[PDB]
Amino acid sequence: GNKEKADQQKAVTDIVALENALDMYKLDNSVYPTTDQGLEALVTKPTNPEPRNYREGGYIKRLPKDPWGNDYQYLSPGDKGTIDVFTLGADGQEGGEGTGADIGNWNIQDFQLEHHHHH
Ligand SMILES: [Ca+2]
Ligand SMILES: [Cl-]
Ligand code: NA
Ligand code: NA
Ligand SMILES: [Pt+2]
Ligand SMILES: [Zn+2]
Ligand SMILES: [Zn+2]
Numbered sequence: 001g002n003k004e005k006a007d008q009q010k011a012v013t014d015i016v017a018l019e020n021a022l023d024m025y026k027l028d029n030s031v032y033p034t035t036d037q038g039l040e041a042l043v044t045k046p047t048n049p050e051p052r053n054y055r056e057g058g059y060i061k062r063l064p065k066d067p068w069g070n071d072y073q074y075l076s077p078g079d080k081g082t083i084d085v086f087t088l089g090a091d092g093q094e095g096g097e098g099t100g101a102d103i104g105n106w107n108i109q110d111f112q113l114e115h116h117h118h119h
């Protein structure tokens, strides 16, 4: 019902937010954060490597939690594209259907409302 569609839109909103914050990091610092620096690099200046041009206050106000209480996941370099930003969904596991499906930057349009789709 409403709950599941709201949860899905929340995941879309967060993944897009994070992807945009990651692009700002790249614009400043010439590279994306590594998997090991993590999404935390968006709020706190990382090490290994230390970025050259870190923005005061970071790149996002806070790290969102996914609709099922788990942290969003991140890989750089990604398996699915240059970076992977994703949630594993309601089942907290790879793959799955329904609310269990994995939502990521690579397939994000699929989980957006219909007006974002290309048919
Ligand atoms: Ca899943
Ligand atoms: Cl299109
Ligand atoms: Na840390
Ligand atoms: Na990707
Ligand atoms: Pt920015
Ligand atoms: Zn981007
Ligand atoms: Zn829209």
Ligand SMILES: [Zn+2]
Binding pocket: 114, 117, 118, 119
């Ligand atoms: Zn569609």
